[PDB]
Design a protein around this ligand. Sequence first.
Ligand code: HEM
Ligand SMILES: CCCCCCCC/C=C/CCCCCCCC(=O)OC[C@H](O)CO
Ligand SMILES: CCCCCCCC/C=C/CCCCCCCC(=O)OC[C@H](O)CO
Ligand SMILES: CCCCCCCC/C=C\CCCCCCCC(=O)OC[C@H](O)CO
Ligand SMILES: CCCCCCCC/C=C\CCCCCCCC(=O)OC[C@H](O)CO
Ligand SMILES: CCCCCCCC/C=C\CCCCCCCC(=O)OC[C@H](O)CO
Ligand SMILES: CCCCCCCC/C=C\CCCCCCCC(=O)OC[C@H](O)CO
Lengths: 157, 156
Amino acid sequence: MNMDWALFLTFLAACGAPATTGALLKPDEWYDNLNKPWWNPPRWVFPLAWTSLYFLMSLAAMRVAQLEGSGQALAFYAAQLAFNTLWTPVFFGMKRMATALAVVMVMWLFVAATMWAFFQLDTWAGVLFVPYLIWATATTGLNFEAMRLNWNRPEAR
Amino acid sequence: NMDWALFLTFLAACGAPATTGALLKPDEWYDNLNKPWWNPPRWVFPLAWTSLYFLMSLAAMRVAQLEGSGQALAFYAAQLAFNTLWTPVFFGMKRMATALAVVMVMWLFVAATMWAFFQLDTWAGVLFVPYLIWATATTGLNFEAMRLNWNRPEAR
Ligand code: HEM
Ligand SMILES: CCCCCCCC/C=C/CCCCCCCC(=O)OC[C@H](O)CO
Ligand SMILES: CCCCCCCC/C=C/CCCCCCCC(=O)OC[C@H](O)CO
Ligand SMILES: CCCCCCCC/C=C\CCCCCCCC(=O)OC[C@H](O)CO
Ligand SMILES: CCCCCCCC/C=C\CCCCCCCC(=O)OC[C@H](O)CO
Ligand SMILES: CCCCCCCC/C=C\CCCCCCCC(=O)OC[C@H](O)CO
Ligand SMILES: CCCCCCCC/C=C\CCCCCCCC(=O)OC[C@H](O)CO
């Protein structure tokens, strides 16, 4: 088990795809009109939190990818990253709050599945995913409260 | 050699890019764009991508059972993430220039995955060859969309 920079930089580069969805986000008047829960963090907190999580989840996957029998864990990891990339355009771009709740809940399950599978192979890789699952829980709560506290337009049938 | 837990996990992972196509079908903005002479008809794309998601998931299932597959699966996660990213950028945001960068990075990771798969399993690499071909055609379509519609602000 080493700091494998080829593995780490590949996983970090993979986090460039969800990072791009946040980068293409302009100040939205529709988002500032939404009634938010009192524990909603300010907008500037989210890019700082996600950058930390990209490094934590890339370091965790780097450790697991060096271990025998990691196939199922890395399959879960690919799944959570893909649905993570999907969520931001659905919520902010398409303004489809109901589908975004379904997307982030699927992301949550794959984040939980990755964390569990990581714990089976390496305790530190599982520990590194714990703040991710916590943040995914708060993100699911923010999506749920935003829909429950605001007007929602019908989406495409 | 079907590890059904592995294949269904990889197939479910492709539900994220498949969802982007379902929530963002090409509208009249896409039909108004100038197209390259070799532009395929609309029905080709759902047939191509559905086949590729099954092909790439079958390839990853074989590799994930093999000693030393960590780097190959890291490349696989990278190509899938940028695969999921492209449709919202091009069709949702209509940022054609940014979408070209996205699909070119995806192409590199698709090629890197194919190379890494060949190092572990010949059949897994073969299954990725039509993906790299289609990713090449996809990059050309993104490039031709910008070059044939440069008078549109969304192309620059
Ligand atoms: C990484 C690149 C791309 C990805 C991941 C992608 C993804 C998808 C998917 C999954 C579908 C099927 C959706 C469904 O069946 O419900 C689809 C449909 C389609 N896409 Fe793409 N695509 C890409 C590139 C392109 C490009 C470059 C173009 C055109 C320039 C394009 C135009 C279309 C069209 C025309 C359809 C079918 C429309 C219809 O069914 O009526 N796609 N895309
Ligand atoms: C054949 C042997 C293996 C060879 C392997 C070669 C392929 C590696 C390609 C890497 C491209 C790097 C892509 C980096 C993507 C980062 C995305 C980004 O830049 O995001 C920044 C943005 O500011 C935040 O939103
Ligand atoms: C031991 C200390 C370690 C420091 C590590 C580096 C610090 C990086 C920034 C963290 C901010 C996170 C907390 C953000 C909370 C913001 C809540 C808020 O609403 O801010 C209101 C304030 O008035 C705004 O102007
Ligand atoms: C209120 C919240 C504020 C939080 C603010 C604090 C932010 C700390 C971020 C990261 C800590 C560093 C974690 C470093 C983990 C490294 C794991 C690792 O690299 O292990 C692999 C090793 O290289 C193989 O031998
Ligand atoms: C083209 C898009 C198609 C989208 C639909 C694709 C099919 C999804 C099927 C089932 C959900 C996947 C569930 C994840 C796999 C569960 C099996 C598993 O993870 O096994 C656990 C392992 O054995 C413990 O060690
Ligand atoms: C276009 C249609 C898009 C379809 C959308 C995608 C479909 C996702 C379906 C099920 C996700 C299930 C989440 C994975 C939960 C796995 C839990 C599990 O199997 O636990 C195993 C154990 O934790 C490991 O050791
Ligand atoms: C526009 C640029 C087009 C570039 C087009 C090339 C892109 C991919 C590069 C090399 C593929 C070679 C991959 C296979 C490398 C050797 C594999 C091997 O060693 O064996 C394979 C098989 O298992 C038994 O021969």
